[PDB]
RNA sequence: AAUAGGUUUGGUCCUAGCCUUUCUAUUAGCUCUUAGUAAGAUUACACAUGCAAGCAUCCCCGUUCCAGUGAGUUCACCCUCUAAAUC
């Protein structure tokens, strides 16, 4: 668990790295801030002119636990329990 | 409550229900008021019945309903 | 006359639709023929005591 | 539950708790339980005065007119509510009970005056 | 004991005694509930002060008698509200007993109602699309003739003395079961002098 | 799903209806009255006081 | 003949819309509420300019000014006086028509008094009854205590004038007497303390200007606009003042002198302005700094 | 992870994103498509991605598929009147097929907005009852009204226990 | 136009012709699996009146509901043979086809 | 099953069952101050006694409802058609 945790956390791509890799702006949308677009990272090199392709349907693998929860089908007496501040 | 098959209570066998006493002046006045009240309410009920029937006919064969039906049929063709 | 609230609603609807008539709403009771309560009822539609002699 | 005969009635269904009555105005089959299945709710009646000293009565007049127009009867307490609202004429017994209260208080006032006169 | 801040509770949080005991962390930062298992009970204890006696592990509020839950001590109340969401922490979050959590929730709401504690107030839309006040519901209705003349809405609202022949007919019909004949009622409702 | 026929219920229904037409009480039985007690001997029910 | 403009005239709305301003950082300030993890999009410079354009459109909706209405006239209409019911009840009945598809200002709400009088409910009873049966989010049946004078001064001391107006808008109808009294007390506290920037980029700035212009107290707002290099707004303020006060000393002076631009503020400062001296000085300073930048 | 390619298709969020709600006339929709051929690719993606969305929004419309029965792909709709609508889909993308059948046989946004409004009339805010059906169960939940005795005991004068005691 | 039959128009495949003037038709509908949220074919059998006995096992037919059922299980009539088994006519071009190949080219009649 | 935890071995890793911690209900033990409110036979076993349906100028109407139970158990929902009943 410790070795896996540190591997995952060391291998995360930042927003600046994502912008540099794709030469596009990274825009953050917050529901608390409404439709205001917040640029979090911009590429240091040239900025692409061609929009990123919009695949109508992404072929990304989903976790059934995440999907089952969003659909209200996840029932657990142990989930979302009140606990001390951590 | 009891069913028609249940037997009558014995403590109530000899009970005789004596009708109330009548005040002739109040009795006659109240009798007339019920006639007038119920005539007025029957007239209101008739109007409410006509409104319900009118709205049913209007929604089925009204001008706005037959017009929208032809429009939908024309848009379909 | 109409009841006090029913009359106010009928008059208010007139004004919303642009009618400016000052005529008083009236409830027609000519068609409501009030029979006496002792008027002979229809015996054909009346029931009959069922057989269970004591 | 198909009942033998019967009809729809606009009446008061009692809710609330002990010593705290609250009425829902509902159109329901007369044979149905007082607080059971109903066809439509047509308003509410709080018989207890609120902080502003008011008894609140909600009336869905559009739907009450609909159900009366569809053959619904009226319970006597509901007819009196409509009399107070001005939607129906004052019920004959609302008028009669008012006259009785006047005659009753006219006798108490006379008795009080006769006692003070003796004193 | 007797706290000298009961009248001005906000002063305790500005004193040196407070800063040494809590610093800049919340008063509940170092509190830990004692319970069996890894998952704690979903309710905290009912109260830490029972008949003037304190339990062995008093909650953050009950363990310091100088902390006064009051709608004016806004600096203390802020410690039990999330700064990012504005929600009041549930009692297991901080470990406060149910008694003090209710007092905190009431003080927090009272401070907001008084304007002493800032909270998010959204921008709402108007109730009505049209603001016209011309409709009869909110304007004058033409008075009815009976109302102008001062008559009852319907004539049968009034008492009309019935004829003597009609009263004799009812005395014959109900002979032997009659009350005394009532006359016209008072014109107004009497009153006890 | 095919409800089993209930023959005894239909049989009894007809027998009851038949017996109610062949053993029907006559006006002389239903509407007789004892003028001393003011009761109907067919049912033993008293008449209303205002009819006495 | 010649009608004076209304608050909702296109000419007035355009003037007040620009004087209000649009600041996307303030208009879309992060709200302190239940949060969700944010989403991220990869955008080109064009896709970003479009998303920012859509935000400006969403902001112009959020800045839509509420209409300024005059106080509603008390309702005192008797439908019937059934005196036979006098003394039969001790408490009055309030009857509310709850038919769903009726505008709330067209709903008959009547009151049967213990005297037997059937009368239309008062404006206060109406808004209370509409909240009981048609509860609106953010509105309370009983008036919150925040609107008491002692509690508004607390909110003003914290510079929370916009929260006061958001609470008043949610609680009271725009033509209510409480709605107008609170707005007027809020506008006056802004004028006294020079807090006009608290309402910029909000839907409440125009109503505040409308109040000052009609009450001939634009001297404070005009100074604030000059000190902030908003002469375009300061010049529009003086023009809006003349439009709503055509037969005035300043409006004639502008006609006689054919004043335009900064000259309007000088004409207004001398004739009608109460703080005419402080405006000329504040305006003089501005022209200097503008010359220093030019040179 | 969720089994199969494009598991997003097996989520309620995806299925509710269909914009084709057929008019009541439509009773049966047959899809004839070919498994191979570059000109029948849109029909294959239409079957793969959108048929589930169409069925989700139109549960009572029969949808039947037929493979390699004809040289080109086409959709055919059977209406209650007895009329048949043949839609040729060869060379068309799946997004164009969805937009085509929406135009000729789908309910417009106005017709759907109306239906949603009529549904709101069923839940009147002024009605009291269980939370499943109404906002509030009792008038005691309204501020200013006499609260429930389970929370605030009533005055002795408003309780029948003491009304009878004094009267008796 | 009214009918007491629930299924007014249905398409199915003829799976039996052993009854006189009656075709046994398998009708499939898509049914959502609530747990998997995947659609699976659910098949149901319908008897359809075929007066001319023109239905062959395997052809796709369109069924129309009768006003009232004519038999215990016969609630529909043959309305149209959509795809005759082995004799399909391409509806898009009107030419005969054998699978994905034309038997007569659409260019014959221009 | 969760933010998980304990437990196989001389030891480790993996798999796996069991149990722990959470929240309700019933019963048992021991213990128990007040007020308000809600809820309240284990048993479709047998039942002492009382009461639970009358109304009304006779006809009729009502006692076919309400109240009860959970034995049996895809008669409950939608459409079509059409009685009785209310207007
Ligand atoms: S639930 Fe309203 S009085 Fe108890
Ligand atoms: K284990
Ligand atoms: K027990
Ligand atoms: K059972
Ligand atoms: Mg082992
Ligand atoms: Mg070993
Ligand atoms: Mg116990
Ligand atoms: Mg029952
Ligand atoms: Mg059992
Ligand atoms: Mg009939
Ligand atoms: Zn504590």
Numbering used by the authors:
A (entry chain D): 345 to 430
B (entry chain U): 27 to 103
C (entry chain 0): 165 to 218
D (entry chain M): 10 to 128
E (entry chain O): 47 to 239
F (entry chain 0): 4 to 55
G (entry chain R): 64 to 358
H (entry chain T): 2 to 169
Paper text:
Mitoribosomes are essential for the synthesis and maintenance of bioenergetic proteins. In this study, we determined sequential cryo-electron microscopy (cryo-EM) structures of stable assembly intermediates and initiation complexes at 2.8–3.2 Å resolution that involve six factors: RBFA, TFB1M, METTL15, mtIF3, mS37 and mtIF2. In conclusion, the model for the SSU progression through the assembly pathway includes a sequence of binding factors as an integrated network, with RBFA serving as a regulator through its allosteric control mechanism, which was not reported in a bacterial counterpart.
We also identified a class with mS37 and mtIF3 without RBFA and refined it to 2.9 Å resolution.
